């Protein structure tokens, strides 16, 4: 599904803290907050070159 991986709103924290400069989920009180969201290396993220149906 083309919506897989992009169901989240995540902005990289950037330079200034010991994180790895990767799009991280918005703040909250869950375990999901602060985790990698978009990259193919991230758990629950988008896959590299999603298999298109065409």
């Amino acid at each position: 599904s083309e919506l897989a991986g992009h169901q989240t709103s995540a902005e990289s924290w950037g330079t200034g803290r010991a994180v790895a400069r990767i799009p991280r989920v918005r703040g909250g009180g869950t375990h999901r907050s602060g985790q990698g969201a978009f990259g193919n290396m991230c758990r629950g993220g988008r896959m590299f070159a999603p298999t298109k149906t065409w």
Partner: peptide, 17 residues
């Protein structure tokens, strides 16, 4: 429950002579 990581929350340093 808590997030995995949280956002963490000044020498000028110019020698002259």
């Amino acid at each position: 429950v808590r997030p995995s990581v949280e956002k963490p929350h000044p020498c000028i340093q110019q020698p002259r002579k």
